[PDB]
Amino acid sequence: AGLLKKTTGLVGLAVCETPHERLKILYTKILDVLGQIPKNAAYRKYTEQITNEKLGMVKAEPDVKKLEEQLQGGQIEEVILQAENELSLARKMLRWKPWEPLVEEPPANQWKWPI
Amino acid sequence: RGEYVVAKLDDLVNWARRSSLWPMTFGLACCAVEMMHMAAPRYDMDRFGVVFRASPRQSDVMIVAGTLTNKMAPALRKVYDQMPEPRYVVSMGSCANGGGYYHYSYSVVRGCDRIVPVDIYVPGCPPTAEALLYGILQLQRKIKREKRLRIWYRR
Amino acid sequence: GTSVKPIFSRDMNEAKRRVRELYRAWYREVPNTVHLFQLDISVKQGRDKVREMFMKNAHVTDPRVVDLLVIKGKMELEETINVWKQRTHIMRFFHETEAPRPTDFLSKFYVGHDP
Amino acid sequence: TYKFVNMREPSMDMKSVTDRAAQTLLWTELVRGLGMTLSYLFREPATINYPFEKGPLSPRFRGEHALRRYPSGEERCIACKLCEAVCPAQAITIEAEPRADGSRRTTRYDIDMTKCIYCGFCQEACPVDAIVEGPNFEFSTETHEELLYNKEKLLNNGDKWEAEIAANIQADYLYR
Amino acid sequence: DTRPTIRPRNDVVHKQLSAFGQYVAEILPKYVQQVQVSCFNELEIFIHPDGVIPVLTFLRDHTNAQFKSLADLTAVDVPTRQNRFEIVYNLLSLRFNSQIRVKTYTDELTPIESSVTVYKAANWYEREIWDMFGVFFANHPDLRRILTGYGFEGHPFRKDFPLSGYVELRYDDEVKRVVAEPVELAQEFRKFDLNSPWEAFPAYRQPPE
Amino acid sequence: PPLTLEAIKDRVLYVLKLYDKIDPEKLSVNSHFMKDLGLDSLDQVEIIMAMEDEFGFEIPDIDAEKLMCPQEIVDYIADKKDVYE
Ligand code: SF4
């Protein structure tokens, strides 16, 4: 364990006295929205791989310090904030459905260098 | 003599006009470094009676320093008009006096003299601090070569 | 082929609609800019100068280009009222200094060997 | 590796608060500024007595140009035209036509001071070290036209700042 | 380094960003037309105009990308292609110390939805492109002229606006103001046709037409 | 006192008379701006603006295009002003 973090070292980014539980509830939350997107999508094929992966590390080891090394995400507040925008990123591409092939192929000589 | 009294008065009127004139800047570009890098202790100019001071209503000579863009052109003209008479302008740097590097570009006027009546030209990219100090010295010597009251009396 | 993405217009109707209150905004703009910027040119002088600039952009027949002229058109009026521009900027359209370029064949022939 | 700057954790003991309270009540950090400034006052200045003495320079100093010449007086310029081929501001204009003794050397060498950048690319571009950056800098003029140099002006400065330039280029050709 | 002249090349970086390029490709293959790694180890993403918001948001919050530092946004205007304005962003990720380039294509008329939602850094990296190039980005807070004279016409950094421009300033006595006029040059900017008539690099040789 | 339609009729036709291009001759009760009087759509924006100063009123652009003759100008503003004399 450890005594409360006096300062996370990043202004604006405050402290959270409930590291593992807040990470977990946010983590099942992103598991929830992962359901609506189809499983066959490479999004869901890749997020659930890292979902079940580092949900185990937070669940197995409850200490703040050991979790920091295992996830290499600085302080927990950074990680949960990082996972927070992962939730928002999950919501945006829920409606986007970027799984069908290219919208349209590029023009013939649009790419390729030199001109 | 009639010419002698106007001669003594003319000297007294402009003897310190070349020693109490106080420079004015606009400090556009890298020439704005030597602008006040001369105000640094090494090439002291405060000793020469000159001392940098914006105060556009209460200054004598403006050292135009940097690249003169068209976008700023109104600002300089309104400053020079607000400038009291007598007034002199010094074009420091190749860009200020003649465009220099950017002479061919679209957003710089080719030389400051196209905008303001330009006195002694000090060249340099940038002019090494004493080169303007030499240029300022030339301006003060030019002040001596003046017959203001003499011309008035001749008329 | 003709498939292009909009910004503000679909049909010339709404395209001509945008230039309508663009004129309306500009029509009411003349009385204040001349007085507040302290000019010499008359109010109707400005109004027709606004007017003629419309006629220059009149031969285009593409809803796709007019709006680009509209946004360019709406990119100037606020620059005048909010004293962003200066006297050399707004009297510039009042093309005054330059000599009048000769128009007949002889006068162009006399001035120089250019078209 | 890194180190913090702001964090201080000022101790709240009776002795420490006394120093902080004393500092605020009877100003001490401000008097420190007075002590530092007064110590500055009792120190000889660094000002230089121009023009009676002028600050130091280097053998590589880049100033007013000059077209040099050989030991016998021949123009080193041959109008190879490399200098304006690298002149970043296109301040160099060169033309060449025949010279009387069968030669076809240059006629025009105008480096516009108001266009020039004094980067020194010209002297490095010259294969015969014809155009160089002279040591002089006191050539301020009151007419824009004066700074517009020509062939004769360049050659005259070459004959004026000759001994100095020759010594500098002799003291610097090993570096280049 | 047995060859001090050449820049030493690295392969562990080379394949890893190559793998990450595939990673982003699979995640959202709707917009990425193709991904190109570089010998300089600068992988680049080629996206579609409608794809600006998705990919930019994707690299911003994703747990394996975290690219949230907008380096720059600019245009590489290429007349020879129908989409002359080539809008390109540069992204930086502090967590995985990598730099991502996302490249689009656009005509003079087609818009691009503003990226201010992704990065508010673009706020001013958006204005100048509209000024310097003329391409207009939709739903942006402001499209003001930031790097030109007031009332300036055209777009300079295009390959159409000449170096000297069209208008020149000068202070005139009659009007008592610095007025404009068609440009006139004391010296014409001389031409330096310097591209050699001999092929330089067989590697980057253009395929025969 | 209210603002009658004969008032509306004259003052709508009054400032229409004041603007420089319109000649008194071709002006009539109908005096359609496009095919009777003869102007441009921007000039149509011009006159409706002149109506704004005459009345001290406001008209939207959604209905400014249909105001194709003084009769509609008279009828349209009388409709919203809710005065029918
Ligand atoms: S003359 Fe040289 S130093 Fe001075 S503004 Fe121009 S480029 Fe900069």
Ligand code: SF4
């Ligand atoms: S100065 Fe040197 S480089 Fe320039 S034209 Fe003469 S010989 Fe050639």
Ligand code: SF4
């Ligand atoms: S020093 Fe001046 S003349 Fe020589 S190459 Fe540089 S800009 Fe041109």
